Each structure stands twice: as C-alpha cells, then as structure tokens.
C-alpha cells in the first residue's frame, strides 16, 4: 500500500479470466483520534 | 468517545456553548451569533489550561 | 425479540477475531472490569448460539454498569439458602422463571 | 477458529494525558524568602503628636 | 448469605488490586472472555461495596460459564417489549425481585 497524501491504500488488482478485463479495486481502513478532550470548544446551533 | 463517560468523570467533556434558547418565542427560537458568544466559550477553555 | 447491536462504537464485528469490550465500572463506580470478547473457538454458531452471545454481551456491557441490577443480585447474597456460590447461580434460575 | 485470536497483549501507546488543573500562578510571583527564625517581627507606626 | 472467595486459585488478593480473571468459556463452549477486574480506582469500598463485589465476582464466574443460567437469560430475551438492551435489563431486574 503506497501512500497518497499520507493514507495508506491498497490497490490490489483481482484475477482475470477472459484476456481483456483488468478488474481493479481501491480501499484504505480510516480511524480519528481527540486525545486530551480540554481544547475543545464547541457553538452548538448558531443560525443557518 | 471512549470508555470514560462525562457522567461519571465531567472532567471529560468540551466547553459549548448552546445558542437554542428554551423560552423565546417558539418554531426556532435560535439566538443568532451574539458577540459574547466567543468570550462566554473563551472563559470556559481558560479553567481547563 | 431483541435488538442489540454491539456496544463499542466503532468495532462491531472485528475482522481480527478479539471484540474488545470498553471498560465498564461496575461496583458503582469504584472498580473497573475492562474485558475482552474472542469469537468463534470451538465452530460455529448454530443460530442458537448467535441468540446467546446476543445475551452475554447485554447482561456484560450494560447490566454490572447499572446500579439497580447489582442491587437485586445484592440481596440475592443475602438470601436463607444461598452458600457455595454455584447454588447463588441457581437460585436466580428459579428467580428468572 | 483463528490460531491467535486468545493469545494477544493489549499495549498501549506512550501517551499520556493530564487533565487536572495543577496550576500555582499566585505563588509564581510572591518573592519567596527563606525564614528560619520563629515568627516575623516588623514595626507599624502609627499617630499621636 | 454467600460466603465467596475469588475462583483463581493462587491470585486471590494481588499487589496492585488488578485481579485477574482465568478464561471461562461462554455460549456452550463457542467463544472465550479473558477479563480482568481492577479494584479500587474512585474510593474504597466502604464496608457495603464489598458485598456487591461479593456479588459482580460471583455472576462473572460462576454464573455465564453455567449452562442453565445462560438460557435462562436467553428465555427473558424472547418476550414482549423486550427490546433497547437498556430495557432489557429493567425486565431481568423486576423478574430477581
């Protein structure tokens, strides 16, 4: 898995059968973190 | 977010700062953006350093 | 019927084999549990035993965590008959039919 | 059935997060001064001519 | 009244209070837990809390090994408005009444 924009993705070509058909795919497997929930500060609602 | 919950432990939660007033007028009440917003939010975040 | 979903926000059903629980805290809230959940270790399950580890996990991530439950299986304990700790097992069976 | 779904070690990561207020900004500016004897003595003068 | 000690047979009363639970096998041999449970973190436990970890020790152990218990909290599972687990519990703790 290379890594486009610091997001590692497979590419991960499937198997052919007919001689012409290059079935490919793309994927990456995410997750986000908020250590030290102290800094943050919301406005909930404001108007639109 | 996690396995603390801001019942138990409220020293896991954000400072906010909800512009949804419970008596106004009714169908959406929805204060608009008052300046003291952003100093009633900054007093919260400077007791949490 | 019943309709858990597993609990932990983003790790439903783990492709690694190990559900890791969230960390419960069980004895109103001055202890903590922090377990584990592996799957699949003897087979399979046979539509039986989806309906039972659709229970474990329920009576596990949110009845220790209340503080009613544990009241009731508190005077459970303090019952005329109730010694040996496989016959406190048994004497909630006949509570729960 | 997998080999080594029992057999794993929760690690944690080098992070470690303080979330407690343990600040000392008053005693940060007072000209601390070491003492030794048994109680401070000064003068206070007041009126009277 | 249950008189109880802990089910690991050398780990009773640790150093550090992580008292770590042994691996018992849950839905009819299927699947495994491997738990831990760490003691006093927000207190002590204050001369009643240690009947109710009497009592959280004893459904952990000797309870969802069982095999009778483990249908008998699959039976209250299948009924009428038992559905939303946090409602599920409060139909399993007004049945241990």
């Given at each position: 898995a290379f890594s486009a924009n610091g997001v590692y993705t497979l590419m991960r070509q499937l198997a052919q059968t007919s001689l012409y058909v290059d079935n490919f795919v793309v994927g990456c497997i995410p997750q986000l973190q908020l250590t030290?929930?102290?800094?943050?500060?919301?406005?909930?609602?404001?108007?639109? | 977010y996690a396995?603390?919950?801001?019942?138990?432990?409220?020293?896991?939660?954000?400072?906010?700062?909800?512009?949804?007033?419970?008596?106004?007028?009714?169908?959406?009440?929805?204060?608009?953006?008052?300046?003291?917003?952003?100093?009633?939010?900054?007093?919260?975040?400077?007791?949490?350093? | 019927?019943?309709?858990?979903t597993p609990?932990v926000r983003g790790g439903a059903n783990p492709a690694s084999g190990s559900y890791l629980?969230?960390?419960?805290?069980?004895?109103?809230?001055?202890?903590?549990?922090?377990?584990?959940?592996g799957y699949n270790?003897?087979?399979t399950?046979?539509?039986?035993?989806?309906?039972?580890?659709?229970?474990?996990?329920?009576?596990?991530?949110?009845?220790?965590?209340?503080?009613?439950?544990?009241?009731?299986?508190?005077?459970?304990?303090?019952?005329?008959?109730?010694?040996?700790?496989?016959?406190?097992?048994?004497?909630?069976?006949?509570?729960?039919? | 059935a997998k080999l080594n779904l029992?057999?794993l070690?929760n690690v944690?990561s080098?992070l470690?997060?303080?979330?407690?207020?343990?600040?000392?900004?008053?005693?940060?500016?007072?000209?601390?001064?070491?003492?030794?004897?048994?109680?401070?003595?000064?003068?206070?003068?007041?009126?009277?001519?």
């Amino acid at each position: 898995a290379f890594s486009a924009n610091g997001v590692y993705t497979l590419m991960r070509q499937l198997a052919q059968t007919s001689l012409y058909v290059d079935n490919f795919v793309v994927g990456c497997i995410p997750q986000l973190q908020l250590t030290t929930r102290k800094n943050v500060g919301v406005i909930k609602n404001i108007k639109v | 977010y996690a396995g603390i919950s801001s019942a138990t432990y409220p020293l896991w939660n954000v400072s906010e700062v909800d512009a949804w007033d419970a008596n106004a007028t009714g169908t959406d009440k929805r204060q608009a953006l008052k300046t003291d917003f952003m100093l009633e939010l900054d007093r919260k975040i400077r007791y949490r350093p | 019927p019943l309709v858990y979903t597993p609990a932990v926000r983003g790790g439903a059903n783990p492709a690694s084999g190990s559900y890791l629980l969230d960390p419960q805290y069980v004895n109103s809230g001055v202890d903590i549990l922090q377990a584990t959940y592996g799957y699949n270790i003897n087979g399979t399950a046979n539509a039986d035993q989806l309906l039972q580890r659709d229970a474990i996990l329920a009576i596990l991530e949110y009845a220790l965590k209340d503080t009613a439950f544990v009241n009731a299986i508190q005077a459970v304990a303090a019952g005329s008959g109730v010694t040996t700790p496989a016959s406190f097992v048994s004497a909630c069976v006949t509570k729960l039919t | 059935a997998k080999l080594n779904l029992a057999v794993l070690n929760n690690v944690f990561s080098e992070l470690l997060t303080q979330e407690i207020n343990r600040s000392a900004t008053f005693l940060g500016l007072l000209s601390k001064y070491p003492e030794r004897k048994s109680n401070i003595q000064w003068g206070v003068g007041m009126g009277g001519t």
